[PDB]
Amino acid sequence: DLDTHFTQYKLARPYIADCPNCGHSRCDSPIAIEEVRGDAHAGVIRIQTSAMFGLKTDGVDLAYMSFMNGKTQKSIKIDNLHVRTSAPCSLVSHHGYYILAQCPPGDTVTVGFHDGPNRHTCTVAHKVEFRPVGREKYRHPPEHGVELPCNRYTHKRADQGHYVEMHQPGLVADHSLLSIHSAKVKITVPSGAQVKYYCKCPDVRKGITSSDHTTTCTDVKQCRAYLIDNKKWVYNSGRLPRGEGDTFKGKLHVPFVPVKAKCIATLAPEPLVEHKHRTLILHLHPDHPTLLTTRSLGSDANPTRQWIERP
Amino acid sequence: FGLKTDGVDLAYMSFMNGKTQKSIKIDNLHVRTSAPCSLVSHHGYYILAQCPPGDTVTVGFHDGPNRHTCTVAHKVEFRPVGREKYRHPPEHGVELPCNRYTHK
Amino acid sequence: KYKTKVPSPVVKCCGATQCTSKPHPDYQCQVFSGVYPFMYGGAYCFCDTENTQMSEAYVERSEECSIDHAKAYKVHTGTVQAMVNITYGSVSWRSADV
Amino acid sequence: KAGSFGDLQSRTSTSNDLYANTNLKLQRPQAGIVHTPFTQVPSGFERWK
Amino acid sequence: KAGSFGDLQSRTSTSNDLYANTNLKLQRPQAGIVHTPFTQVPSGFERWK
Amino acid sequence: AKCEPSQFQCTNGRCITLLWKCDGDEDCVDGSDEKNCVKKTCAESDFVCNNGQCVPSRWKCDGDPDCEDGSDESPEQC
Amino acid sequence: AKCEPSQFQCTNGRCITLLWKCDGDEDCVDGSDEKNCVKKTCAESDFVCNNGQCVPSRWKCDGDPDCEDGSDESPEQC
Numbered sequence: 227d228l229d230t231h232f233t234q235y236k237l238a239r240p241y242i243a244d245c246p247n248c249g250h251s252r253c254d255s256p257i258a259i260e261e262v263r264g265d266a267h268a269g270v271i272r273i274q275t276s277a278m279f280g281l282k283t284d285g286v287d288l289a290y291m292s293f294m295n296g297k298t299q300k301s302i303k304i305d306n307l308h309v310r311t312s313a314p315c316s317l318v319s320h321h322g323y324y325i326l327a328q329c330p331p332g333d334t335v336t337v338g339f340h341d342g343p344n345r346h347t348c349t350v351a352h353k354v355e356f357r358p359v360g361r362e363k364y365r366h367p368p369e370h371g372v373e374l375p376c377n378r379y380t381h382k383r384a385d386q387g388h389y390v391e392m393h394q395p396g397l398v399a400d401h402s403l404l405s406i407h408s409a410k411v412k413i414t415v416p417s418g419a420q421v422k423y424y425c426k427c428p429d430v431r432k433g434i435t436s437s438d439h440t441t442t443c444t445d446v447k448q449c450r451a452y453l454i455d456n457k458k459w460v461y462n463s464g465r466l467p468r469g470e471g472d473t474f475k476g477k478l479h480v481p482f483v484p485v486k487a488k489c490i491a492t493l494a495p496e497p498l499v500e501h502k503h504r505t506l507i508l509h510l511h512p513d514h515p516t517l518l519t520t521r522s523l524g525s526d527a528n529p530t531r532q533w534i535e536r537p
Numbered sequence: 538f539g540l541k542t543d544g545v546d547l548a549y550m551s552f553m554n555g556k557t558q559k560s561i562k563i564d565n566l567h568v569r570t571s572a573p574c575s576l577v578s579h580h581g582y583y584i585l586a587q588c589p590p591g592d593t594v595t596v597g598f599h600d601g602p603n604r605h606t607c608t609v610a611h612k613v614e615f616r617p618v619g620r621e622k623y624r625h626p627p628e629h630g631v632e633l634p635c636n637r638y639t640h641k
Numbered sequence: 642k643y644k645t646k647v648p649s650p651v652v653k654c655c656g657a658t659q660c661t662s663k664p665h666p667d668y669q670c671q672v673f674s675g676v677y678p679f680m681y682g683g684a685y686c687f688c689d690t691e692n693t694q695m696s697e698a699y700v701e702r703s704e705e706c707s708i709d710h711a712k713a714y715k716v717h718t719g720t721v722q723a724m725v726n727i728t729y730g731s732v733s734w735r736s737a738d739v
Numbered sequence: 740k741a742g743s744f745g746d747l748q749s750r751t752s753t754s755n756d757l758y759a760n761t762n763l764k765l766q767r768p769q770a771g772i773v774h775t776p777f778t779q780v781p782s783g784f785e786r787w788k
Numbered sequence: 789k790a791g792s793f794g795d796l797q798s799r800t801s802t803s804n805d806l807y808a809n810t811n812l813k814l815q816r817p818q819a820g821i822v823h824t825p826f827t828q829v830p831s832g833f834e835r836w837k
Numbered sequence: 838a839k840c841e842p843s844q845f846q847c848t849n850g851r852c853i854t855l856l857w858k859c860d861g862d863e864d865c866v867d868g869s870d871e872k873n874c875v876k877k878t879c880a881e882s883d884f885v886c887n888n889g890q891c892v893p894s895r896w897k898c899d900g901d902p903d904c905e906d907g908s909d910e911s912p913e914q915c
Numbered sequence: 916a917k918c919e920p921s922q923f924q925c926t927n928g929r930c931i932t933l934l935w936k937c938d939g940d941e942d943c944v945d946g947s948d949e950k951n952c953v954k955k956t957c958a959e960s961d962f963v964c965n966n967g968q969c970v971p972s973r974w975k976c977d978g979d980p981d982c983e984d985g986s987d988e989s990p991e992q993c
């Protein structure tokens with residue numbers, strides 16, 4: 227079944243976190259990139275974001291994604307969800323907070339999605355490198371060659387013993403809760419939520435209200451309002467303020483865990499070999515930087531190691 | 538960019554269709570220099586974009602089924618400010634004075 | 642390869658907090674006073690400078706460490722074994738580990 | 740040593756006592772931004788490889 | 789010789805008798821894939837250029 | 838042709854790991870991997886929706902429609 | 916923090932240079948700067964269409980609708 231992989235992810239929600247580059251400037255991005263795992267060989271990278279992929283407010287659906295639209299969680303169909311480093315990446319699979327992409331080398335990692343006329347992107351500085359397998363520095367997985375063991379992030383969503391902690395969300399400061407109303411600050415409390423307020427006008431007032439409350443202050447700038455809604459938890463992101471007390475609420479498995487796999491490595495052209503008295507002459511015509519090593523089979527190995535980049 | 542024969546509107550674009558001036562809504566206006574550039578703003582003849590290093594500068598837009606592009610040879614380089622040759626604006630670090638084209 | 646785990650910072654508005662030691666590898670904790678952070682919903686704290694952000698970070702083994710790791714071994718004299726192929730007279734080749 | 744082969748040492752791959760020696764230093768968050776910036780010596784294992 | 793200027797030789801540009809000396813080695817197809825993989829020394833004419 | 842004992846042969850003839858024999862992902866292009874799966878149950882601590890969904894009890898009648906049809910918030914439940 | 920008289924502060928709590936207080940660009944995500952503004956007049960050499968758009972008199976009744984409305988080319992005007 228598919229729902230068995232989202233039993234814990236259904237208890238978490240997306241969040242808006244600081245993104246260094248929301249197109250041209252820093253902003254609080256609903257698609258903020260938390261981590262880029264790029265230690266796999268054939269350019270496979272796993273990107274952790276603040277957005278939830280494969281979940282909708284109504285349940286599980288791999289065609290749908292969910293993101294925060296301010297205080298309100300929005301659930302939309304995945305539309306032009308893309309990952310880019312130096313060129314478009316092929317998307318392998320996606321899971322809550324996590325995107326698996328097949329990316330070429332680059333200096334940056336860009337993740338973004340479309341929501342009708344809106345565009346949400348997040349570009350982070352992260353050196354993505356292509357790691358070839360074996361003694362040849364190939365720049366793209368070859369069609370054919372020698373099959374060698376390699377490290378890859380599996381495309382499977384299933385739990386393989388790697389988890390991250392999800393914590394109760396911290397105070398969500400939101401000035402849209404306050405209204406001047408009748409020249410007297412009113413605190414609007416969303417249904418089912420609680421709003422903590424802190425006002426330092428002549429009449430210093432603070433507390434937690436579960437319902438619309440009218441304070442003694444006459445200017446919204448004199449107050450702060452924080453939304454308290456613990457229905458859904460969030461990853462303990464380093465870009466979100468921590469809650470009070472023990473905020474730990476559960477564990478979320480890490481999808482697409484690194485695994486051992488078999489990768490096809492390039493096979494350099496066969497050398498031309500010429501023989502002379504006690505001498506071996508090799509004419510090497512590599513396609514990519516190819517490592518040549520030799521050693522004597524006597525008591526002194528006298529090893530040789532050099533990378534051949536040109537004939 | 539931002540002008541139409543009928544007035545001013547940052548959502549609208551105007552270009553010549555032979556002898557006749559055509560005005561359309563900006564549709565996939567893009568800048569590319571070896572990779573897509575983030576558009577900052579546009580005004581009249583000028584387009585402001587944040588482009589990664591590249592050998593060419595490609596600018597183009599769509600007008601329904603038509604695609605109008607122009608690619609010119611121009612070395613676009615990233616010029617890190619300071620004593621470190623970083624390749625992309627860092628998330629955090631030391632705030633140093635630099636030269637920028639204002640978006641205004 | 643190590644992984645750097647960074648829990649959510651404690652942002653104390655109109656006040657101050659103190660760091661405490663914890664049994665975590667390479668644990669770091671520092672309180673930065675005079676912060677005035679902003680969120681999507683506006684200014685997070687009320688006071689202009691009487692606020693502190695406590696940053697915490699520690700080192701963990703990355704997920705790759707289960708597969709992509711190097712084992713450091715102490716090597717001592719052990720044993721020597723061989724596979725021997727023997728034939729004699731009219732008896733065909735027979736072999737065993739010795 | 741930090742940035743060297745043994746920067747990260749663990750008696751076994753499943754142990755609950757990890758030795759880590761990196762110049763992990765917390766930097767001041769940028770003005771108005773809630774984040775936890777830090778500097779650290781690049782992995783000595785990646786260097787070794 | 790393969791990889792050298794004269795690896796490919798023809799008396800004329802329209803000649804029907806072509807001499808070719810490349811280390812063309814047929815490789816075993818990948819398991820389950822219908823294809824004809826091969827290894828060959830890069831052209832010695834392009835190398836000469 | 839026969840696969841290894843620890844593998845599942847899709848109708849396409851391609852072998853697939855037995856662990857993948859039934860899960861959310863169709864590991865073979867023919868899709869016969871998941872065609873014969875059977876739906877799992879859910880704990881009694883989760884309110885099973887009318888259309889077959891299952892949401893935690895604490896979310897039942899909480900003022901937010903968690904099922905695809907709002908069963909948890911429909912007047913039939915509270 | 917609260918900002919000097921050289922800078923304007925948006926309802927979002929963030930500050931914007933005072934020269935950007937009303938210049939047609941929303942400099943703060945909340946749009947508090949441009950949400951409050953007023954239009955300026957035009958010289959006597961320019962005609963004003965029904966939408967208030969200004970156009971030079973040399974463009975009046977010239978056969979081209981140089982403004983949102985056709986008032987510059989309207990028969991009632993020409």
Ligand SMILES: *[C@@H]1O[C@H](CO)[C@@H](O)[C@H](O)[C@H]1NC(C)=O
Nearest residue numbers: 724725726727734735736737
């Ligand atoms: C022993 O030698 C014979 C002949 O060389 C060969 O047939 C046999 O396979 C060898 N044994 C092993 C274990 O290789």
Ligand SMILES: [Ca+2]
Nearest residue numbers: 857860862864
């Ligand atoms: Ca499957």
Ligand SMILES: [Ca+2]
Nearest residue numbers: 896899901903
């Ligand atoms: Ca509900």
Ligand SMILES: [Ca+2]
Nearest residue numbers: 935938940948
């Ligand atoms: Ca402005």
Ligand SMILES: [Ca+2]
Nearest residue numbers: 974977979981
């Ligand atoms: Ca006119």
